[PDB]
Amino acid sequence: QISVRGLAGVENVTELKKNFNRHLHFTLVKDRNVATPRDYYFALAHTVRDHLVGRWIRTQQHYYEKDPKRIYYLSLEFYMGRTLQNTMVNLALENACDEATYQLGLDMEELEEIEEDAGLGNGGLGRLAACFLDSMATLGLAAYGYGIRYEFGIFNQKICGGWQMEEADDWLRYGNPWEKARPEFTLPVHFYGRVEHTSQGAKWVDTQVVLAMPYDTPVPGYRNNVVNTMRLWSAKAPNDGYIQAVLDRNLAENISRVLYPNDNFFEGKELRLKQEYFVVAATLQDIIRRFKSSTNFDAFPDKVAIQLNDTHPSLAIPELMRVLVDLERLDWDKAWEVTVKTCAYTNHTVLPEALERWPVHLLETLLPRHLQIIYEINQRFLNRVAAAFPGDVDRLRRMSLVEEGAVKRINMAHLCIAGSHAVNGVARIHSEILKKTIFKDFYELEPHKFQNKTNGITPRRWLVLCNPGLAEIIAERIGEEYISDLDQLRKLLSYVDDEAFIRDVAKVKQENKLKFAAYLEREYKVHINPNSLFDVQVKRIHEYKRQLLNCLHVITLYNRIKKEPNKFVVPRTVMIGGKAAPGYHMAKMIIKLITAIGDVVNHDPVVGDRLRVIFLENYRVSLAEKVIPAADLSEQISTAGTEASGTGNMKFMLNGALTIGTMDGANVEMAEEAGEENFFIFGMRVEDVDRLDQRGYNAQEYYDRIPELRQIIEQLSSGFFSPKQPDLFKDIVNMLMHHDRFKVFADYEEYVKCQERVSALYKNPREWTRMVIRNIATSGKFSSDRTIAQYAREIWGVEPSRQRLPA
């Protein structure tokens, strides 16, 4: 049907059709009279998968022959989403498969909907890893994603009586066609034991062994025939009364059982520490094995880069030391040199509660040798600080890897900085925050180490895949090359006064909104006005992301309508979605508040279809692909200084929504690229937040001086939104009035006024759309291809390449 989806060549359609029937028969062991849509999905998946195989084997043997520097991206999270469409798009097979399936009497879109999200991540951090893998393959880098194959990913969210319920995400139920088990490359990982000092050196003995079994998933580049590998480790018990011994194997296998859902919040659980060491230990053995298969580790950093994502794989540093010193018998200083030059650290958040500080007594029991190594690292590091800042004893305690207190802890961030040749934040303002406040001491010691790498999103998944209509009308004007060179979208500025283009942009959006409005009615039995402004806030539920500020605005619009029912207001559908961590009580109350507001607003006859409030259940990657293309307004309203980057923001910008946001994270750079005129900026800057903290934040002051705000609080306290439970939202009110770390009231007035300017512009369709065009056209910077090219050149020391391998 459309250009970007590739060719539907007769011979290719014929081959696809026959391989589809082959898989249905020989792989699924079904006939067409008993097959269900799920069987058809799997037959298609196997048919598409076959096309990866040759390229995957060729790519990997190519890396063996040429022996480039290898990039190892270590993360506890990879939020991959669905793989089928992505693979089709990247192999140029989408229209052919569409045609082939159509000719067999099947709707391919329907089969695509059967695939489960691979939800091996919480949100932005996990999704960044997924976008990054796509970009690394597209840029021809010899890159491996390494993580854990969780049996259960991020929980499925059900809303019951307005409350979040968590259900196990049993994503492997029907099998995963995209993974290849590699039980032959299983490696041992050690835990517990104790350290023995011999004449030869230290020795870690009496350990409990857990096996790490790899599963490889292919990562196809965009139309370059490169297929890289994501290797995820699964925990297996070694083979060495009777019945119970067999059942106790589960204890070891529990390591890879479930993803911790407590995003941006450190809890210090032992099982999580085991997960972290598990991924690190197996990965480094694999890395070393691959390096040796080409005594001398001098060239190790020329052939290996290890990128640490947050502190979660920070044990890579002492593990690499352990292997080099205890097993390879390198001297400490040489080992350290190799380690530092091999490792680099990316910080993704400065929220204090997210910082990993592991109790020493835990490390002592679980990883006794690693604690010894960390102590040694600390002593040599502080000697360097002492020599550079003589007499500065408070600096010494501030920079130490060891924190003193009732319980001694190890600060994993400090460890990462010490053992890495580069440290980066993920947006300019965040990286500056690192140098100025959080890691100031370290920046003063080693300024050369600190960098910025502003985040990005992949334009394959986040434009071509999820918004084919938009990708097509753009390709009509400027061709297809932008898909792997997103800066080319700048060429769209010369169409900002083009009447046909303005019409096309607005048509694509309207179609996306109709499609999404239909999804709502069909799959969730709820009606919305598709001519309303689609006001969307989708992200994890957290106080810092200030879903509550959005709630206050919604209640304000509602009270205004009730006060003057017969005045015109721009109709809105306000959509809020996202998951709360299971033990985050305040986040769960916020969800309940949103649904409660919806209960009142959506059933008030006076309001009509002028204001609707929907909580989008089970927000996840597959749902983001549907809602983001349908959005008019993107809510990016975190308190300045708290969102390190954000990436949802970028997705919305690329897909034709306008942004209302604070000058936080990557929003700053988005406003800078599009022009501040083309961005709905409001609220405190970081500097204002600091000024207010020095003075003391008093919420009461705002309650006293803003009647509209006062009314909302009184409605909350009195039970207006909770008739049968008048005091249900007391915790929320109390938090807002007395212990709001994120200053919701401080931005309320400017937010509401800024929202009025949004409504004003939406009344002028032509000027709305022209501003949209200016956003889309300047979104090029926020491609993960740009981000990864920067990592490659400035951190890993490798050159990206768009040259294709032979098919």
Ligand X SMILES: O=C(/N=C1/NC(=O)[C@]2(O[C@H](CO)[C@@H](O)[C@H](O)[C@H]2O)S1)c1ccc2ccccc2c1
- What are the residues binding ligand PLP (CB under 6 A)? 123-124, 127, 539-540, 620-621, 624, 646-649, 651
CA atoms of 507 and 709, how far apart (whole Å): 38
Alpha helices in 681-729 (DSSP H): 686-695, 699-705, 707-718
Which is nearer to ligand X, 132 or 703 (by Cβ)?
Answer: 132
Q: Does residue 539 carry a catalytic annotation?
A: yes
626 is in an annotated binding site: no
Write down the catalytic residue from 46, 127, 149, 348.
Answer: 348
Which residue from 39, 337, 643, 669 is in contact with ligand X, where contact means CB under 6 A? 643
Q: Does residue 25 carry a catalytic annotation?
A: no
Q: Does residue 197 carry a catalytic annotation?
A: no
Is 485 among the residues that bind a second copy (CB under 8 A)?
Answer: no
Which is nearer to a second copy, 247 or 387 (by Cβ)?
Answer: 247
Q: Tell me the window of 51-59, 509-517, 556-564, 761-769 that interacts with a second copy (CB under 8 A).
A: 51-59
Contact positions with ligand X (CB under 6 A) in 434-473: 455
Is 645 among the residues that bind ligand X (CB under 6 A)?
Answer: yes
Q: Does residue 436 carry a catalytic annotation?
A: no
403-413: string of b/e by CB count within 10 Å (b at 16+)? eeeeeebbbbb
CA atoms of 404 and 779, how far apart (whole Å): 46
Write down the catalytic residue from 231, 430, 509, 651.
Answer: 651
* Phi-psi region at 162: left, alpha or beta (left = phi > 0; alpha = psi -120 to 50): left
Q: How far is CA 337 from CA 307, 321, 326, 420, 439, in A?
A: 16, 10, 16, 10, 22
Give least dist CB 246 to a second copy, A.
5
Which residue from 86, 87, 95, 122 is in contact with ligand X, where contact means CB under 6 A? 122
DSSP lists the bridge partners of residue 217 as 230
Give least dist CB 647 to ligand PLP, A.
4
Coil, helix or strand at residue 268: coil
DSSP one-letter code for 606: T
Which residue from 200, 239, 293, 296 is in contact with a second copy, where contact means CB under 8 A? 239
Give least dist CB 206 to ligand X, A.
30
* Size of the residue set binding ligand X (CB under 6 A): 22
CA atoms of 279 and 282, how far apart (whole Å): 6
Is 210 among the residues that bind ligand X (CB under 6 A)?
Answer: no
Which is nearer to ligand PLP, 140 or 578 (by Cβ)?
Answer: 578
DSSP lists the bridge partners of residue 74 as 146, 308
64 is in an annotated binding site: yes
CA atoms of 172 and 116, how far apart (whole Å): 9
CA atoms of 147 and 527, how far apart (whole Å): 41
Which is nearer to ligand PLP, 123 or 641 (by Cβ)?
Answer: 123
CA atoms of 764 and 776, how far apart (whole Å): 19
Give least dist CB 327 to ligand X, A.
30
Write down the catalytic residue from 357, 540, 592, 781.
Answer: 540
Is 160 among the residues that bind a second copy (CB under 8 A)?
Answer: no
Which residue from 21, 27, 254, 262 is in contact with ligand X, where contact means CB under 6 A? 262
751 is in an annotated binding site: no
Pair 402, 358: CB distance under 8 Å: no
CA atoms of 77 and 334, how far apart (whole Å): 32
Which of 493, 552, 454 lies closest to 786 in space, CA to CA?
A: 454
Which DSSP string corresponds to 82-97? --HHHHHHHHT-HHHH
Q: Does residue 182 carry a catalytic annotation?
A: no
Partner in contact with 539, chosen from a second copy, ligand PLP, ligand X, none, beta carbon below 5 to 8 Å by kind: ligand PLP
793 is in an annotated binding site: no
Which of 284, 231, 233 lies closest to 255 in space, CA to CA?
A: 233
CA atoms of 636 and 567, how far apart (whole Å): 29
Is 125 among the residues that bind ligand X (CB under 6 A)?
Answer: yes
Which is nearer to ligand X, 455 or 722 (by Cβ)?
Answer: 455
Residue nearest to ligand PLP (CB): 648
Q: Which amino acid is at 642?
A: T
Which is nearer to ligand PLP, 212 or 590 (by Cβ)?
Answer: 590
Which DSSP string corresponds to 154-203? SPEEEEETTEEEEE---TTTT--TT-EE-GGG-EEEEES-EEEE-SS-EE
Residue tagged 């990864």 (tokens) = 788
Q: How far is CA 556 from CA 463, 598, 702, 753, in A?
A: 34, 13, 15, 11
Exposed / middle / buried, residue 425 (Cβ in 10 Å: 0-12, 13-18, 19+): buried
Q: Does residue 490 carry a catalytic annotation?
A: no
Write down the catalytic residue from 430, 435, 461, 545.
Answer: 545
Partner in contact with 624, chosen from a second copy, ligand PLP, ligand X, none, beta carbon below 5 to 8 Å by kind: ligand PLP
Which residues, including other chains, have CB under 8 Å from residue 671's CB and lie 6 or more apart? 659, 661, 663, 679, 681
Partner in contact with 87, chosen from a second copy, ligand X, ligand PLP, none, beta carbon below 5 to 8 Å by kind: none
Radius of gyration of the chain, Cα coordinates, nearest whole angstrom:
27
Which is nearer to ligand PLP, 321 or 471 (by Cβ)?
Answer: 471
CA atoms of 430 and 451, how far apart (whole Å): 10
Give least dist CB 741 to ligand X, A.
15
Contact positions with a second copy (CB under 8 A) in 6-35: 25-26, 29-31
Which is nearer to ligand PLP, 461 or 513 (by Cβ)?
Answer: 461
Which is nearer to ligand PLP, 369 or 461 (by Cβ)?
Answer: 461
Q: Tell me the window of 251-259, 308-316, 720-728, 753-761 that interacts with a second copy (CB under 8 A).
A: 251-259
Active-site amino acid positions? 348, 539-540, 545, 647, 651
Binding residues for AMP, as ranges, are 31, 64, 289-294
For binding to a second copy (CB under 8 A), which residues are involved?
A: 25-26, 29-31, 36, 38, 50, 53-54, 56-57, 61, 152, 155-156, 166-168, 170, 173-175, 180-181, 183-184, 237, 239-243, 245-247, 249-250, 254, 257-258, 260-261, 269, 271, 582-583
